[PDB]
Amino acid sequence: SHMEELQNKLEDVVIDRNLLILGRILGEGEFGSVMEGNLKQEDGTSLKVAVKTMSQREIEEFLSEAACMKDFSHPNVIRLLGVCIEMSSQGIPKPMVILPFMKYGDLHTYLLYSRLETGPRHIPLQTLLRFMVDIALGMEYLSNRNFLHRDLAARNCMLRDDMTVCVADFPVKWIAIESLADRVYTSKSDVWAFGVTMWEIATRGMTPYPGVQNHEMYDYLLHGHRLKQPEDCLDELYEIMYSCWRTDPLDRPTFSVLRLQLERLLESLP
Numbered sequence: 001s002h003m004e005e006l007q008n009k010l011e012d013v014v015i016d017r018n019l020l021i022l023g024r025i026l027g028e029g030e031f032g033s034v035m036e037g038n039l040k041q042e043d044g045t046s047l048k049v050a051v052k053t054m055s056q057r058e059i060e061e062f063l064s065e066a067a068c069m070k071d072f073s074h075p076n077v078i079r080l081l082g083v084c085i086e087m088s089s090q091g092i093p094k095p096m097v098i099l100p101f102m103k104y105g106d107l108h109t110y111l112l113y114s115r116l117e118t119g120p121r122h123i124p125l126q127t128l129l130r131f132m133v134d135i136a137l138g139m140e141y142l143s144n145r146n147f148l149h150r151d152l153a154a155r156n157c158m159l160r161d162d163m164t165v166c167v168a169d170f171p172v173k174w175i176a177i178e179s180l181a182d183r184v185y186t187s188k189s190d191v192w193a194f195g196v197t198m199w200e201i202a203t204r205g206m207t208p209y210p211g212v213q214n215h216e217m218y219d220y221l222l223h224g225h226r227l228k229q230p231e232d233c234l235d236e237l238y239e240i241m242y243s244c245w246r247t248d249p250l251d252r253p254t255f256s257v258l259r260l261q262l263e264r265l266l267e268s269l270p
């Protein structure tokens with residue numbers, strides 16, 4: 001049963017606080033913190049992990065959502081290893097998300113660093129397209145199980161040690177024309193965000209819509225303007241990203257269609 005499944009997943013997602021030690025802060029904000037940790041595994045050895053730290057309703061909501069996310073199982077979707085709920089000395093709940101430690105970090109920062117001499121080398125065309133195919137694959141998986149991401153952007157995609165990209169962390173310039181209008185939000189809204197993310201990748205990390213301010217965005221799109229084609233981006237790659245921003249959501253391709261379009265393009269390169 002539907003209740004049965006949710007109880008199982010809840011059982012599976014929680015981690016004994018004993019099995020975890022927290023280390024240095026890697027990052028910090030109004031969101032909360034990201035810290036390094038070690039997780040003791042069933043096999044007796046420890047794993048390096050990343051720990052993201054953030055009413056009983058709100059806690060149960062977190063747990064239920066965490067339960068669903070742990071259940072995703074795809075190479076291009078980040079594996080949620082589990083959650084711990086600690087409490088502050090003020091008696092405020094401190095929910096912790098346990099994720100793999102990814103030494104190459106988020107895709108956005110990686111693109112920026114490739115433009116510096118000490119960072120990764122210049123990233124060729126083929127590899128930038130590969131990153132897009134990986135993200136599409138992860139998004140194809142999620143939409144096929146009716147999950148909406150809602151914050152898809154290059155900063156929320158992670159690079160794994162083998163250079164595979166996975167979608168993670170489930171921002172006016174990423175938001176589709178109709179979710180600006182109606183606050184209405186489908187998987188075709190995620191498709192819109194994916195096209196923007198593809199543009200971030202093809203520009204090696206530019207902010208979308210240079211020259212245009214966040215308050216101007218809705219009116220800019222309302223008059224039919226879209227992101228411009230990046231320099232040295234194939235015409236056919238641009239066509240694909242432009243399809244993501246078609247005014248009417250039903251005209252946008254699905255992630256499945258996009259993904260095959262991107263794989264074909266990639267296949268065709270020397």
Ligand SMILES: CCCCNc1ncc2c(-c3ccc(CN4CCN(C)CC4)cc3)cn([C@H]3CC[C@H](O)CC3)c2n1
Pocket residue numbers: 026027034050052078099100101102103104105106155158168169
């Ligand atoms: C879904 C969020 C968690 C996903 N996992 C994860 N794992 C790791 C990191 C690091 C990070 C990794 C390594 C180092 C030191 N060396 C750097 C050079 N390298 C070759 C060896 C290691 C420093 C920071 C930053 N982040 C942040 C990305 C941006 C996110 O917004 C917030 C976490 C990380 N996130």
Ligand SMILES: [Cl-]
Pocket residue numbers: 020021022
């Ligand atoms: Cl600890």
Ligand SMILES: [Cl-]
Pocket residue numbers: 077078079100160166
């Ligand atoms: Cl992963």
Ligand SMILES: [Cl-]
Pocket residue numbers: 205206207
């Ligand atoms: Cl830039």
Ligand SMILES: [Cl-]
Pocket residue numbers: 208209210226227228
């Ligand atoms: Cl632009």
